[PDB]
Amino acid sequence: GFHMPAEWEPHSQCWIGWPERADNWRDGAVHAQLVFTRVAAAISRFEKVTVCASSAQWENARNQLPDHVRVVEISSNDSWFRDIGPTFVVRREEHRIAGIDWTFNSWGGLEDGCYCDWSLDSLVKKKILDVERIPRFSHSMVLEGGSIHVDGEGTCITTEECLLNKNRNPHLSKSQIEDELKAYLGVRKVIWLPRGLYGDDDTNGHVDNMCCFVRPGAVLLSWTDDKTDPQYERSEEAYSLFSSVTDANGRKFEVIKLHVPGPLYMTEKEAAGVFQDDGAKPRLPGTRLAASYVNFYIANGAIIAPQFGDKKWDDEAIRVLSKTFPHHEVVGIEGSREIVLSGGNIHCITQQQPAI
Amino acid sequence: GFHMPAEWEPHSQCWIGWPERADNWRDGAVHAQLVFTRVAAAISRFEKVTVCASSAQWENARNQLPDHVRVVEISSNDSWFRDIGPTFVVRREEHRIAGIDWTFNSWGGLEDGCYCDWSLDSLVKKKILDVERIPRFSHSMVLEGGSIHVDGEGTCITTEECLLNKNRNPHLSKSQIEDELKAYLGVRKVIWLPRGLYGDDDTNGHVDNMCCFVRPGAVLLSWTDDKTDPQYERSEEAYSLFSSVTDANGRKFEVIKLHVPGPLYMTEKEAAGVFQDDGAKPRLPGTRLAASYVNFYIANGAIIAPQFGDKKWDDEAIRVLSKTFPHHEVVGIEGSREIVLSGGNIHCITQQQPAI
Ligand SMILES: NCCCCCC(N)=O
Ligand code: NA
Ligand code: NA
């Protein structure tokens, strides 16, 4: 009787890593640390937070973060807890909470991943559940928490582009992958968007950059009105798909558009501050960033939302999110661009722990 | 209104470190790891245990330890949590528990300490209390938990050999030192044994290796019958002091003698197992081991006692302890010699967290 609750359901805390690697984070992560800190501090106005930092970084993190934020020493290859963190499941009313330890392979493994070493990334789920004394359900299937979303009422959305990629689970068919999601997330229906966001070659189109539930029966969808942008056809396809399906309880989808910023491109400055290495992916100037306002975190009573420094769409997204979540305080995080330069945003760096 | 409760009072958990440094533990610590495992398994029969291992050892510790033992990642320079973990204090009838973060300096600093780098060790207290979300009282005075003992009724016992060494707090008088113990452990009287155990030049004579309370107004004392042994005059002297002095409530001290084993000396095999490095104290053959059954741990209704493989005195200690602690299950830990080779025993590697 375990299932994954919706993100907007109450949490007891939020887990976040701490960026440090010089080959992914410009200027040895100094810029990224400031934003991580702003995100943690914002979330901690609404729910407890634990940031996890390496040995070498523990003091830095402790120094930057207010005291009501807990800092623990957990090493990682990189700081993306949405994907390397456990996925918590609950059984409400004698263990009422547990965590799923999905196999992690750096978003594509030796042939098509981001780093050739992920052995510390792989232990993060175990380590966290050990700190909390929460039971771990281990799974040999490759999965990242960024690649699924739920409504806590039986429905899951995901993308084919990610989950059906041969760099993940080449041994499993689509319908075998679906059976695992249903068994382990406690859902009875999976909606497969064909594609994620244009330009998300890091993760191969994680759904959490393209689409998310905001309540039972309604989703936000990354969108552009520019039919010359390669995003348009993906967004249109997903929109049609949502018109044709219903959720696990038979609701018609209310689709709410959320216009992407930019498009945004890495500068020569931004590329130049990243140390170059032959065990990481070479970040080049002119690369299109995979930027969507959809990559936000729902905290108890607040939406923690990206701002990329594109004023028109930064302001429009705050407006859409304020009306979409009328009972939440919406807090935009200036400097989110510093996270998208390295492959993700606010939702990618968080992992909620549901209250029981 | 905080005070240090006595060791025999109820605990919520025990903290232990994980040995790894090969310049102190023979054969890269493989012998000691087996013993710490045994010690933690034994304690875990009576109270929740958390072992703390570095990143490089986390999997190894998690493998060796039973599932009901929590394993977290807290790196340290060495694994002596009596001295480098926090000293918990409580306030009975709003925060009811806190920890004291004494300054640590590797048992005598750059000049006379055990290793030249202790900066990981210095953070262990912060980190443990951060994990537990327990307030921390910072203290600038150098002190080790091993150098003090309390009855939980206003009395403290320690040694001048340790606390009045110029390698600890050279700018404080005896009186100033005594003031800080009173304010911070909530004791009204401090008994100063002049000396600890012979050959304990690591710690400069921790009381936890010489003498401990059994109950208010009663103590076990490290003892030999051999008056040709250097230990005799130290023991004799301490015995004398207990005849003369009273506790904080003006009770007289029942003393119970506990015969030391050996003398024990480090084999050639033992010394050669240890890697030779300049930043740690060079372990030489023929060196007298600072062994004493007094270095035991009181868990919730158990006594976790050393056994050094010197059967005469091994059996005698269990006897004396089962007698002295008739409401407690005594538990001997074969292989305790592996710990003493690196300069402490069971008491030295534990740190109780009082239940509130
Ligand atoms: N370089 C890997 C970036 C991870 C982004 C995760 C996500 N939730 O889309
Ligand atoms: Na990839
Ligand atoms: Na010393």
Author numbering:
A (entry chain A), B (entry chain B): 12 to 104, 112 to 374
Quote the passages of the study that discuss this structure, keeping the authors' original sentences.
Herein, we describe the structural characterization of AIH from Medicago truncatula (MtAIH), the model legume plant. The enzyme is responsible for the second step of the AGM pathway of PUT biosynthesis, that is the hydrolytic conversion of AGM to N-carbamoylputrescine (NCP) with the release of ammonia. AIH belongs to one of the seven types of guanidine-modifying enzymes (GMEs). It is a member of the pentein superfamily that is characterized by the propeller-like arrangement of five repeated motifs that form a narrow channel with a central, negatively charged core. The monomer of MtAIH is no different in this matter, i.e., five motif repeats (I–V) are arranged around fivefold pseudosymmetry axis that is aligned with the catalytic tunnel in the core of the protein.
Therefore, the conformation of the complex is similar to the conformation of the enzyme with the bound product after the reaction, representing a highly probable NCP binding mode. This can be explained by the nonphysiological character of AHX in comparison to AGM or even NCP; binding of the ligand was enabled due to its high concentration. In the case of the unliganded structure, the dimer is created by a crystallographic twofold axis, while in the MtAIH-AHX complex, there are two almost identical dimers in the asymmetric unit. On the other hand, in the structure of MtAIH-AHX complex, the electron density clearly shows their position. Therefore, this disorder-to-order transition secures the appropriate conformation of the bound substrate before reaction and the opening of the lid loop helps with product release after catalysis.
